[PDB]
């Protein structure tokens, strides 16, 4: 999981 | 300066800036985004055109912008799940997506004015104004990659632990 925040 | 007032309160008012508002509004929206991104600890932010977003601001009786919410249209989102504890903060989500309309891309309240229902009223304003002639339910909004503060807020606001999340990869 990357995520547009962390 | 024409101003789009969504809701008015004893302690301030919520306004909205649209992608086709005058430059002065779009700069103020940008200044506020810059502060938020910085507050969240980002050095650089390279994303798609803000022409998708709508920016809601809570304006105090002293004309200070103390709350900000940036909304964007979305199609689907994922129920958040607590990370299983280790034997000796993060989150996960379900694999099946659910339909959603409004994604809350950024939400911020000046720290000395937190726990005064500002964020709750900003989401309320969004649910009533994001889509013409409709009031979104709590099951039709999602939050991007929530911070710990975001989780605590969203789980209370949505009244469930498994509120909708978006903006992630695998
Ligand atoms: C990515 O950006 C995602 C969109 S998540 C980003 C969330 N924003 C931040 O992390 C920036 C720094 N923090 C904030 O800006 C604020 O904490 C929030 C915007 C998360 C919440 O703002 P506000 O403080 O105005 O919320 P409400 O008064 O409306 O809260 C309603 C209920 O939610 C629970 N809760 C809210 N905030 C809580 C925090 N720090 N800690 C524990 N619980 C929190 C409370 O139940 C609160 O209701 P009460 O009656 O006050 O208890
Ligand atoms: Mg409480």
From TrEMBL, chain B:
> Its domain of life?
Eukaryota
Q: Any idea where this protein resides?
A: Nucleus
**Predominant location:** nucleus
One GO term of the biological process aspect = mitotic sister chromatid cohesion
Which keywords does this Swiss-Prot/TrEMBL entry list? Acyltransferase, Cell cycle, Metal-binding, Nucleus, Transferase, Zinc, Zinc-finger
MF term (GO), any: zinc ion binding
The positions annotated for binding CoA are 109, 115, 117, 119-120, 147
Stretches assigned to the N-acetyltransferase ESCO acetyl-transferase domain: 98-166
- One GO cellular component, as annotated: nucleus
Q: Which family does it belong to?
A: Belongs to the acetyltransferase family. ECO subfamily.
| Descriptive protein name | XEco2
Q: Which gene encodes it?
A: xeco2
User: Which residues of the complete protein appear here?
Assistant: 523 to 702 of 702
